[PDB]
């Protein structure tokens, strides 16, 4: 009844949530993981076809660039145990983002995870990893530029419909709703091309507290903004 | 400090209906609201204001009339005018009035006023992409040297301050294929106020909210 086929969520607020409890950041990450499981569960049980998730990091600015990098590795590493669970729940997993510089072992783990679940018929879960909406448009542009160089494409032949076929998730239903938790009212270079016509829904709720009733609220807001 | 504000103007028609009036009446109050927003922005030190008339030859002629009767005043008021969007198919007379209007004000140093006409964010990115494909075809550019900075140099308004705040009136919470590339880091502010009613107090509310959020985030 919500009529929403594909929801994207900019998750934020985990560190502030922990801070308020008098707990260190790591406890926030723990509670945030639980909230991710819960939103994925809700989406699957509510007939949403695709759910795309972006972890917005409020602390990354204070982290040296080389820690960030290693942080991307732990993510893929953790993503080897979690896939087993996603697969048991009939979830099809896709990673979107610039994974070309990750080491071969990671790239292999990622492809194997997407291959394992590619045939599942449940929710399609897209996880952003090293993703940027401008980078997304740029990688599509590069693919087209390569065709132009080969001599198979004239610059005047490039139109929206063609660039669209080369940005992330072009093969899935278009994003109908973007939710951003944590209070900030910005897209922060998450999807740009893909959100041209999506409903944007912002809530002050911190990610760890964002639960099924908050997700239903966004979906009903969407249904009503029709 | 907000340097560039973009506004998705919407609600003139709904506004006229609530008054029991026709669409033309909503357009008239709408023009007055554009005038007040432009003055407000110029008076409060905003460097660029970008306006997008959201709609769900008569016009083309009015566009000519509008340019002919207001450009001298915008020039006088030190406003730099730019039209962003695909005007490639407007009639030549109008295309020439646009070009001349931008040329006459190209040197002004006050508010840059960007008016969208047949503009779309995807189209904007696509025109930038065509320009880069031309250099690849010419042989002056390798596909793998194309990066964000380079495409950024080929989308509308790259010569101005980055868009800091996007305001959409009328109650919808969508970008509707207005700016996309350009709003990657902008504060987004939605208000149910209908365009004709959008006034200095409403505009101040969006500006104060931007400044406070800049402080908090
Ligand atoms: O746990 P802390 O945030 O205290 C820190 O160890 C960095 C870190 C270590 C181990 C795991 C994580 C972590 C865990 C879950 C999600 C994410 C984490 O780090 C990021 C960054 C960006 C997005 C998501 C997550 C972060 P720090 O160097 O910032 O103190
Ligand atoms: O816990 P369930 O298997 O019941 C389910 O929530 C799916 C799910 C469970 C647990 C974790 C995740 C998930 C998915 C991808 C990556 C990561 C997940 O949780 C973490 C924690 C830390 C790092 C990465 C991930 C998803 P479901 O919708 O399939 O029932
Ligand atoms: O919310 P904050 O910006 O405070 C921060 O927790 C980063 C963060 C944002 C959003 C989600 C998560 C997070 C935490 C644990 C598990 C997972 C998170 O995001 C995903 C995506 C996919 C699978 C698992 C998780 C972390 P931080 O490390 O910058 O303090
Ligand atoms: O600057 P960006 O916002 O583009 C990004 O690189 C930030 C980022 C850097 C490093 C790790 C993560 C990240 C994202 C989701 C889940 C987890 C991340 O890091 C960890 C560590 C341990 C468990 C989960 C996650 C995010 P992104 O991967 O969220 O696109
Ligand atoms: O078709 P008509 O000539 O009857 C009329 O709609 C013309 C009209 C007057 C004023 C504004 C508009 C109008 C309508 C849709 C979009 C835009 C309009 O004006 C601008 C300016 C710049 C960008 C978009 C629009 C139309 P009207 O208000 O004089 O009845
Ligand atoms: O607000 P609505 O979407 O109801 C509609 O008035 C279209 C419209 C939206 C926003 C502004 C305008 C409009 C009206 C009069 C003058 C000008 C308008 O937009 C601009 C931009 C620049 C200069 C003058 C005007 C028209 P409509 O013609 O589709 O009913």
UniProtKB/Swiss-Prot annotation, chain A:
GO terms for cellular component: cytoplasm; cytosol. Substrate binds at residues 12-17, 25, 29, 57-59, 61, 63, 180, 186-188. Changing residue 193 to F: Decrease in affinity for both IPP and decaprenyl diphosphate substrate analog. Changing residue 63 to A: Decrease in activity. Keywords: Cell cycle, Cell division, Cell shape, Cell wall biogenesis/degradation, Magnesium, Metal-binding, Peptidoglycan synthesis, Transferase. It is an enzyme of class 2 (transferase). Its cofactor is Mg(2+). InterPro entries: UPP_synth-like, UPP_synth-like_CS, UPP_synth-like_sf. The record marks 55 as: Required for continued chain elongation. GO terms for molecular function: ditrans,polycis-undecaprenyl-diphosphate synthase [(2E,6E)-farnesyl-diphosphate specific] activity; magnesium ion binding; protein homodimerization activity; small molecule binding. The record marks 123 as: Important for determining product length. Pfam families: Prenyltransf. Signal peptide: none annotated. Isopentenyl diphosphate binds at residue 199. Inhibited by bisphosphonates. Changing residue 204 to A: Slight decrease in activity. CDD domains: Cis_IPPS. Binds 2 magnesium ions per subunit. It comes from the Bacteria. Changing residue 48 to A: Formation predominantly of C(60) and C(65) polymers rather than the C(55) polymer. The active site is at residues 12, 60. Homodimer. Generates ditrans,octacis-undecaprenyl pyrophosphate (UPP) from isopentenyl pyrophosphate (IPP) and farnesyl diphosphate (FPP). UPP is the precursor of glycosyl carrier lipid in the biosynthesis of bacterial cell wall polysaccharide components such as peptidoglycan and lipopolysaccharide. Belongs to the UPP synthase family. This is Ditrans,polycis-undecaprenyl-diphosphate synthase ((2E,6E)-farnesyl-diphosphate specific). It comes from Escherichia coli (strain K12).
């Amino acid at each position: 009844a919500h009529g929403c086929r594909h929801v994207a969520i900019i998750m934020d607020g985990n560190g502030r949530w922990a801070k308020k409890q008098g707990k260190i950041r790591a406890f926030g990450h723990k509670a945030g993981a639980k909230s991710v499981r819960r939103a994925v569960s809700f989406a699957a049980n509510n007939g949403i076809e695709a759910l795309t998730l972006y972890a917005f990091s409020s602390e990354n600015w204070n982290r040296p660039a080389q820690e960030v990098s290693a942080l991307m590795e732990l993510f893929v590493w953790a993503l080897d145990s979690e896939v087993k669970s996603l697969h048991r729940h009939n979830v099809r997993l896709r990673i979107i983002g610039d994974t070309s510089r990750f080491n071969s072992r990671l790239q292999e783990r990622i492809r194997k995870s997407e291959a394992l679940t590619a045939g599942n018929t449940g929710l399609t879960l897209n996880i952003a990893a090293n993703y940027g909406g401008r980078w997304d448009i740029v990688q599509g542009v590069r693919q087209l530029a390569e065709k132009v160089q080969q001599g198979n494409l004239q610059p005047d032949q490039i139109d929206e419909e063609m660039l669209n076929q080369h940005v992330c998730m072009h093969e899935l239903a278009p994003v109908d709703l973007v939710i951003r938790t944590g209070g900030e009212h910005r897209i922060s270079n998450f999807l740009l091309w893909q959100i041209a016509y999506a409903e944007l829904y912002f809530t002050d709720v911190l990610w760890p507290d964002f639960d099924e009733q908050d997700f239903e609220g966004a979906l009903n807001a969407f249904a009503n903004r029709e």
